[PDB]
Amino acid sequence: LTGTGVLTESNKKFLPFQQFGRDIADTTDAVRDPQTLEILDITPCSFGGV
Amino acid sequence: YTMSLGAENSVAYSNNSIAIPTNFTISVTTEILPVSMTKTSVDCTMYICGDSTECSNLLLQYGSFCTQLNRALTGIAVEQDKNTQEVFAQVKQIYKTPPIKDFGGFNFSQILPDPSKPSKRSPIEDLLFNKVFNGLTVLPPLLTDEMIAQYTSALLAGTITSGWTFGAGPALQIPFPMQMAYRFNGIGVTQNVLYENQKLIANQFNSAIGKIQDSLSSTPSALGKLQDVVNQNAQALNTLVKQLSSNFGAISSVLNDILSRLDPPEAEVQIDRLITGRLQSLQTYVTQQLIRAAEIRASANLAATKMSECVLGQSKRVDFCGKGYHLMSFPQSAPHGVVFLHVTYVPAQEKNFTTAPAICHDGKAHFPREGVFVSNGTHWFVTQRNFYEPQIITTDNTFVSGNCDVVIGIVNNTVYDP
Amino acid sequence: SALGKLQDVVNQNAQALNTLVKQLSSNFGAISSVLNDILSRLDPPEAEVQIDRLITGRLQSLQTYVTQQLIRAAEIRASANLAATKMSECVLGQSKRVDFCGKGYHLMSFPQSAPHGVVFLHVTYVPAQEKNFTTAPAICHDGKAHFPREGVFVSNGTHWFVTQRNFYEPQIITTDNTFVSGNCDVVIGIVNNTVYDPLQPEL
Amino acid sequence: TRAGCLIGAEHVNNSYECDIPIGAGICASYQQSIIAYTMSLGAENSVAYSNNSIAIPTNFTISVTTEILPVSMTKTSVDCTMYICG
Ligand SMILES: *[C@@H]1O[C@H](CO)[C@@H](O[C@@H]2O[C@H](CO)[C@@H](O)[C@H](O)[C@H]2NC(C)=O)[C@H](O)[C@H]1NC(C)=O
Ligand SMILES: *[C@@H]1O[C@H](CO)[C@@H](O[C@@H]2O[C@H](CO)[C@@H](O)[C@H](O)[C@H]2NC(C)=O)[C@H](O)[C@H]1NC(C)=O
Ligand SMILES: *[C@@H]1O[C@H](CO)[C@@H](O[C@@H]2O[C@H](CO)[C@@H](O)[C@H](O)[C@H]2NC(C)=O)[C@H](O)[C@H]1NC(C)=O
Ligand SMILES: *[C@@H]1O[C@H](CO)[C@@H](O[C@@H]2O[C@H](CO)[C@@H](O)[C@H](O)[C@H]2NC(C)=O)[C@H](O)[C@H]1NC(C)=O
Ligand SMILES: *[C@@H]1O[C@H](CO)[C@@H](O[C@@H]2O[C@H](CO)[C@@H](O)[C@H](O)[C@H]2NC(C)=O)[C@H](O)[C@H]1NC(C)=O
Ligand SMILES: *[C@@H]1O[C@H](CO)[C@@H](O[C@@H]2O[C@H](CO)[C@@H](O)[C@H](O)[C@H]2NC(C)=O)[C@H](O)[C@H]1NC(C)=O
Ligand SMILES: *[C@@H]1O[C@H](CO)[C@@H](O)[C@H](O)[C@H]1NC(C)=O
Ligand SMILES: *[C@@H]1O[C@H](CO)[C@@H](O)[C@H](O)[C@H]1NC(C)=O
Ligand SMILES: *[C@@H]1O[C@H](CO)[C@@H](O)[C@H](O)[C@H]1NC(C)=O
Ligand SMILES: *[C@@H]1O[C@H](CO)[C@@H](O)[C@H](O)[C@H]1NC(C)=O
Ligand SMILES: *[C@@H]1O[C@H](CO)[C@@H](O)[C@H](O)[C@H]1NC(C)=O
Ligand SMILES: *[C@@H]1O[C@H](CO)[C@@H](O)[C@H](O)[C@H]1NC(C)=O
């Protein structure tokens, strides 16, 4: 499952069978690291008007 | 069932009978108005194309559509600060109440800022405040809640210590119960009524205003009017975002899957298909946001005039500053809006009296100078029409016009000559 | 930036018009924005696809223009409604509405014509040069409580006078500019003074 | 700032009447460089309130306020057929 952004440690807890999570608008919010199983949050890369 | 329109009632109408209130009550009405809405904006290019370069370049074939959309949302965002400023910034200076809050028995601690709290909001404002990413962004307001609270505080301090003069001119001090006396004369009730009932009035006021804090804690649907604004905008935003998952006839909603799965000369057809779909949904969002903005502006305009006429003055407009005879108002800050506490005089405990349009006296017709002529069953008195307070009929509270052969329903009495 | 408010209306409409016209140069996916080049360059059975493509694009941009023009028209109508009521109440009368006919106590207004709008010159009375005075809600006199008939009771430090509240103009307190209601044991903050009786000098 | 990252303006501890608004209580203006500050809401003032004191104006002034309102806009119209198809 693809995406782009900044990966940080998550404080969320996934159930043992869950691989990634989604927010209210059904957008990927977090993923599980498939090798060590830590949960990583995905934040957007900053952008905005200048 | 068939709904009832109101209680069954009848007025005891008679050609020679009037009812006059003998005791009044004071109540506080809470009126909530939205002033502004969340300054949501989204750029057309990132919303539609994300990080797909061929989409970004293809989108230029739609000319200025993105410019028009970006401009319309920018215009709304600016308007929202204009709406806030024209409602709360009614003052020239920030006024504060004195350390010694002696207002003649009138307790305003519920509406004045609470110095023990870091937010320095009033006990009532606390309830008003406590109860209420892919190309999109939300910009902060110019005036933060703290600054709105400061303007509101200035308005209360002005209203309490200088009446309406801080609005029309410099803030000139006046004893609180004395400006209340002015406010009573302003509704056709002579000021002596207040001074002989100052303790009663202060107690009715203190209770009526204290009840606002209690009522708002037990009624979830008290601030629904401001919540509805938040909900409509939240739904519009969430709908706009979920709509990106719609494919509009394309093989996939995701540009990154079609550009990598489907050869470019055909992928462009599906990219263009997605752009038309997404551009249309964005146009729909902006159009509704402009219409919604107009509704908020109209409310902000109402709040602005209402503050000037209800808070920085005493309107004479019926049911404009709440139901009853308007005395004064005290604004409170709320998220995305303003709440007015309207203090009104309400007639009560009326009694039936017999009346006459004039008194006949040695051939002359005497009309009341300011009040009405009433009879208690044995004697004629003249009273103000908004509060029973009988006076002997004299030549100083009546005037003569014409004679006893002209007025219909004229009665014979004695007019005292001092 | 005095008349910017009327200029902003002109500018928004000028931009909407100019945008609508420049938008015709947009091709919306067609090989050319110009109908005359596609009808002469491309065989009819296919040219119709590009003609239809341009129509959808141009029809959409026109629909967008009209929609915004209707919304903008509503804003202007609301302003016109305000101007209409404001003229009736500020020019053809004297409103009592605070900050409606400008800041201060409204006296009168004089309208002036402007391109696409109206300008009101509001003439207002503004209090100034105030002084501190001591007050009382009533004057106590031989047991009766006297309230001001129209103004307020003030003291200059040695004598009590009655003044209109919007302009200092002291009068001796007399029975003709006060009225009696109740007595000295009821009013809070009542002060002792002498109320002049205009009849006493003769009787 | 809360609004965003402001580069080139200096931060000062003096509040001023606003000029060019930024957001979140911050405004900027030009002094001899561009500054950013928390905006002032109005002048500091207090009313000399007392239970037995009133202020009464002794001299008045008269002023004229100019209020501008739009009434109408250019009556622009376009026919759909000629606009689209020429
Ligand atoms: C104004 O009203 C407030 C209540 O809203 C009064 O504060 C209370 O004072 C009593 C003591 O008499 C305390 O036991 C309560 O806990 C206080 N309540 C709150 C919410 O603080 C206040 O004293 C009144 N002030 C005046 C001048 O009457
Ligand atoms: C006018 O109405 C008020 C109530 O609004 C009366 O005051 C109350 O009198 C009762 C005794 O009958 C007391 O228990 C209440 O505590 C009083 N309330 C307040 C706020 O003071 C008042 O007596 C009535 N006056 C007249 C002339 O009828
Ligand atoms: C109408 O009002 C008058 C004046 O108050 C009442 O007459 C007085 O009644 C009291 C007894 O309650 C006597 O002590 C006074 O001497 C009477 N005054 C006069 C001038 O007679 C009269 O009773 C009231 N009428 C009704 C129907 O209530
Ligand atoms: C008020 O007083 C006048 C007298 O000043 C009364 O006038 C009488 O009217 C009747 C007709 O109804 C005549 O027949 C009498 O001759 C008139 N009297 C005099 C002295 O001229 C008048 O009726 C009285 N009105 C009421 C309601 O009592
Ligand atoms: C309050 O006003 C009174 C009346 O104007 C002042 O008393 C007068 O003072 C003048 C001198 O300036 C005398 O010529 C008058 O004869 C005085 N009139 C009376 C009735 O005494 C009084 O001085 C003023 N008080 C203050 C504190 O200014
Ligand atoms: C106004 O004048 C009255 C007298 O007409 C004063 O009444 C006195 O009040 C005190 C209590 O403070 C009593 O001990 C006296 O016996 C009362 N005098 C009389 C003659 O009854 C009243 O105090 C005066 N008020 C002011 C502010 O001076
Ligand atoms: C990844 O390899 C480590 C060995 O270093 C192993 O302990 C771990 O369980 C492996 N992770 C998964 C998901 O199999
Ligand atoms: C006046 O009298 C009528 C009877 O004709 C009665 O129905 C009405 O309630 C009375 N009104 C008051 C205020 O006493
Ligand atoms: C009221 O009507 C009665 C007739 O029922 C009449 O006798 C009386 O004079 C009238 N009073 C007035 C003030 O019109
Ligand atoms: C009234 O007196 C106070 C001092 O308590 C002073 O600050 C205020 O400026 C005075 N007002 C006028 C109008 O002289
Ligand atoms: C004002 O307050 C003082 C107490 O500081 C009191 O003695 C005086 O009588 C009060 N005056 C009025 C009009 O309330
Ligand atoms: C503002 O005041 C603080 C001390 O509270 C000081 O450390 C800071 O340098 C000052 N900033 C400016 C721009 O003067």
Side-chain angles (χ1 to χ4, degrees), chain A residues 1-25 27-28 30-32 34-50, chain B residues 1-50 52-116 118-144 147-213 215-216 219-220 222-245 247-256 258-262 264-294 296-395 397-400 402-418, chain C residues 2-25 27-36 38-42 44-74 76-175 177-180 182-199 201, chain D residues 1-31 33-86:
Chain A
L1 64 134
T2 61
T4 178
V6 178
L7 301 173
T8 69
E9 294 85 356
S10 179
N11 293 309
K12 296 175 185 178
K13 294 166 72 187
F14 284 17
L15 298 175
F17 62 89
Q18 295 176 313
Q19 294 183 30
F20 65 95
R22 292 195 284 183
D23 71 6
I24 275 54
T27 297
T28 302
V31 297
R32 173 177 283 169
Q35 296 177 351
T36 197
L37 291 37
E38 67 175 355
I39 308 304
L40 308 172
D41 286 339
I42 300 160
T43 61
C45 290
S46 67
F47 70 94
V50 179
Chain B
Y1 51 86
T2 300
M3 67 180 281
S4 177
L5 303 182
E8 183 69 14
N9 194 273
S10 63
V11 177
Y13 180 83
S14 186
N15 62 346
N16 65 349
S17 183
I18 193 164
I20 299 172
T22 68
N23 206 353
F24 61 88
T25 65
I26 297 169
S27 64
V28 179
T29 295
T30 300
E31 182 179 1
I32 296 102
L33 293 95
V35 174
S36 66
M37 64 182 187
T38 299
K39 296 195 293 180
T40 299
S41 65
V42 57
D43 69 290
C44 179
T45 297
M46 187 172 170
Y47 170 79
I48 295 171
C49 293
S52 294
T53 300
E54 52 269 51
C55 182
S56 179
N57 290 105
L58 197 154
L59 183 59
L60 270 292
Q61 299 297 7
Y62 288 89
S64 68
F65 271 123
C66 287
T67 300
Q68 292 173 53
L69 293 167
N70 290 345
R71 185 182 296 163
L73 292 171
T74 298
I76 293 169
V78 173
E79 186 175 58
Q80 296 310 302
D81 285 298
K82 184 266 196 70
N83 286 339
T84 299
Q85 183 181 34
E86 73 180 352
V87 174
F88 292 98
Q90 304 302 325
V91 299
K92 302 160 196 161
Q93 297 93 38
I94 305 302
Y95 307 111
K96 298 191 291 285
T97 55
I100 300 170
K101 292 171 176 52
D102 183 354
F103 300 116
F106 291 82
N107 189 339
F108 302 112
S109 68
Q110 294 290 75
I111 60 169
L112 297 173
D114 183 342
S116 73
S119 65
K120 85 112 161 189
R121 298 195 182 95
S122 70
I124 292 169
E125 285 173 328
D126 283 341
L127 290 172
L128 297 176
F129 279 90
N130 288 342
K131 290 204 302 290
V132 178
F133 61 77
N134 52 345
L136 61 100
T137 183
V138 177
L139 302 175
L142 179 60
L143 299 175
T144 61
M147 290 179 169
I148 298 302
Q150 288 180 35
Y151 278 127
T152 299
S153 181
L155 292 169
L156 267 59
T159 299
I160 293 167
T161 63
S162 62
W164 49 81
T165 64
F166 78 91
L172 275 61
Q173 73 270 23
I174 187 167
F176 183 82
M178 190 171 283
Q179 74 165 282
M180 189 63 90
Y182 289 12
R183 290 172 186 280
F184 271 54
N185 284 342
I187 60 166
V189 179
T190 56
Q191 66 190 79
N192 57 290
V193 171
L194 178 141
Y195 289 115
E196 295 187 3
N197 290 283
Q198 183 175 327
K199 181 163 73 71
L200 181 148
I201 290 165
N203 285 333
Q204 289 179 339
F205 171 76
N206 291 339
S207 294
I209 203 163
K211 287 177 181 178
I212 298 302
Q213 188 182 45
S215 179
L216 292 173
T219 304
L223 270 283
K225 188 176 278 186
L226 301 185
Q227 186 63 44
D228 286 337
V229 173
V230 172
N231 290 340
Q232 288 181 34
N233 286 278
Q235 290 173 353
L237 191 156
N238 189 53
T239 298
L240 181 64
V241 173
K242 286 187 174 184
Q243 187 62 14
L244 290 169
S245 295
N247 61 47
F248 308 105
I251 65 173
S252 169
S253 69
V254 179
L255 290 167
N256 288 335
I258 64 171
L259 70 89
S260 61
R261 184 188 301 168
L262 174 63
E266 182 64 27
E268 288 183 2
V269 176
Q270 275 55 276
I271 292 168
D272 191 73
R273 190 75 167 276
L274 289 170
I275 290 166
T276 298
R278 289 176 172 179
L279 183 60
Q280 182 180 217
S281 75
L282 183 57
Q283 183 66 61
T284 298
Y285 169 82
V286 171
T287 299
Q288 289 188 348
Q289 196 66 3
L290 287 166
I291 293 168
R292 188 177 296 108
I296 297 299
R297 172 173 53 75
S299 181
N301 286 344
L302 179 58
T305 176
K306 194 161 295 211
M307 191 174 286
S308 293
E309 296 181 33
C310 299
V311 178
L312 276 64
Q314 184 184 19
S315 72
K316 215 107 301 188
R317 297 168 67 181
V318 174
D319 294 357
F320 181 68
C321 301
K323 158 260 178 177
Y325 295 93
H326 187 56
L327 295 174
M328 68 192 311
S329 299
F330 301 108
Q332 299 281 265
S333 176
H336 296 298
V338 65
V339 178
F340 293 98
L341 303 180
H342 302 297
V343 181
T344 61
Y345 176 96
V346 179
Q349 298 184 32
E350 70 276 12
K351 294 203 293 189
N352 284 347
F353 296 102
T354 296
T355 62
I359 300 301
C360 186
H361 185 62
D362 62 13
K364 297 182 287 292
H366 292 253
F367 293 90
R369 188 178 302 286
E370 294 190 7
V372 297
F373 290 130
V374 299
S375 169
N376 75 351
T378 63
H379 293 77
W380 287 94
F381 301 95
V382 57
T383 62
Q384 65 189 300
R385 68 281 306 272
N386 295 304
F387 187 80
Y388 183 71
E389 186 164 81
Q391 300 174 49
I392 60 167
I393 299 169
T394 78
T395 59
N397 57 22
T398 66
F399 67 92
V400 177
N403 64 59
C404 297
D405 294 322
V406 178
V407 176
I408 298 167
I410 194 167
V411 300
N412 291 24
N413 206 57
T414 297
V415 179
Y416 175 77
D417 184 342
Chain C
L3 270 283
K5 188 176 279 186
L6 301 185
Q7 186 63 44
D8 286 337
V9 173
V10 172
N11 290 340
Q12 288 181 34
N13 286 278
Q15 290 173 353
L17 191 156
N18 189 53
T19 298
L20 181 64
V21 173
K22 286 187 174 184
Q23 187 62 14
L24 290 169
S25 295
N27 61 47
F28 308 105
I31 65 173
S32 169
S33 69
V34 179
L35 290 167
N36 288 335
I38 64 171
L39 70 89
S40 61
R41 184 188 301 168
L42 174 63
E46 182 64 27
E48 288 183 2
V49 176
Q50 275 55 276
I51 292 168
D52 191 73
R53 190 75 167 276
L54 289 170
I55 290 166
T56 298
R58 289 176 172 179
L59 183 60
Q60 182 180 217
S61 75
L62 183 57
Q63 183 66 61
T64 298
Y65 169 82
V66 171
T67 299
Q68 289 188 348
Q69 196 66 3
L70 287 166
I71 293 168
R72 188 177 296 108
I76 296 299
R77 172 173 53 75
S79 181
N81 286 344
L82 178 58
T85 176
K86 194 161 295 211
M87 191 174 286
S88 293
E89 296 181 33
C90 299
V91 178
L92 276 64
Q94 184 184 19
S95 72
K96 215 107 301 188
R97 297 168 67 181
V98 174
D99 294 357
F100 181 68
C101 301
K103 158 260 178 177
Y105 295 93
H106 187 56
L107 295 174
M108 69 192 310
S109 299
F110 301 108
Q112 299 281 265
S113 176
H116 296 298
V118 65
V119 178
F120 293 98
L121 303 180
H122 302 297
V123 181
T124 61
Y125 176 96
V126 179
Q129 298 184 32
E130 70 276 12
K131 294 203 293 189
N132 284 347
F133 296 102
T134 296
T135 62
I139 300 301
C140 186
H141 185 62
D142 62 13
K144 297 182 287 292
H146 292 253
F147 293 90
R149 188 178 302 286
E150 294 190 7
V152 297
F153 290 130
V154 298
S155 169
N156 75 351
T158 63
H159 293 77
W160 287 94
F161 301 95
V162 57
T163 62
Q164 65 189 300
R165 68 281 307 272
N166 295 304
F167 187 80
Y168 183 71
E169 186 164 81
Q171 300 174 49
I172 60 167
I173 299 169
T174 78
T175 59
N177 57 22
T178 66
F179 67 92
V180 176
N183 64 59
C184 297
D185 294 322
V186 178
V187 176
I188 298 167
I190 194 167
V191 300
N192 291 24
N193 206 57
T194 297
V195 179
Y196 175 77
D197 184 342
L199 183 60
Chain D
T1 71
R2 192 265 184 83
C5 183
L6 178 62
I7 302 170
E10 66 175 7
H11 182 213
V12 301
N13 281 356
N14 295 321
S15 64
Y16 301 89
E17 184 179 5
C18 186
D19 189 8
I20 302 169
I22 294 171
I26 304 298
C27 292
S29 66
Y30 179 68
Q31 296 294 103
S33 69
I34 298 168
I35 62 168
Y37 51 86
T38 300
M39 67 180 281
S40 177
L41 304 181
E44 183 69 15
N45 194 273
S46 63
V47 177
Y49 180 83
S50 186
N51 62 346
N52 64 349
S53 183
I54 193 164
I56 299 172
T58 68
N59 206 353
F60 61 88
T61 65
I62 297 169
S63 64
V64 179
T65 295
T66 300
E67 182 179 1
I68 296 102
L69 293 95
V71 174
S72 66
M73 64 182 187
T74 299
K75 296 195 293 180
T76 299
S77 65
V78 57
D79 69 290
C80 179
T81 297
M82 187 172 170
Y83 170 79
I84 295 171
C85 293

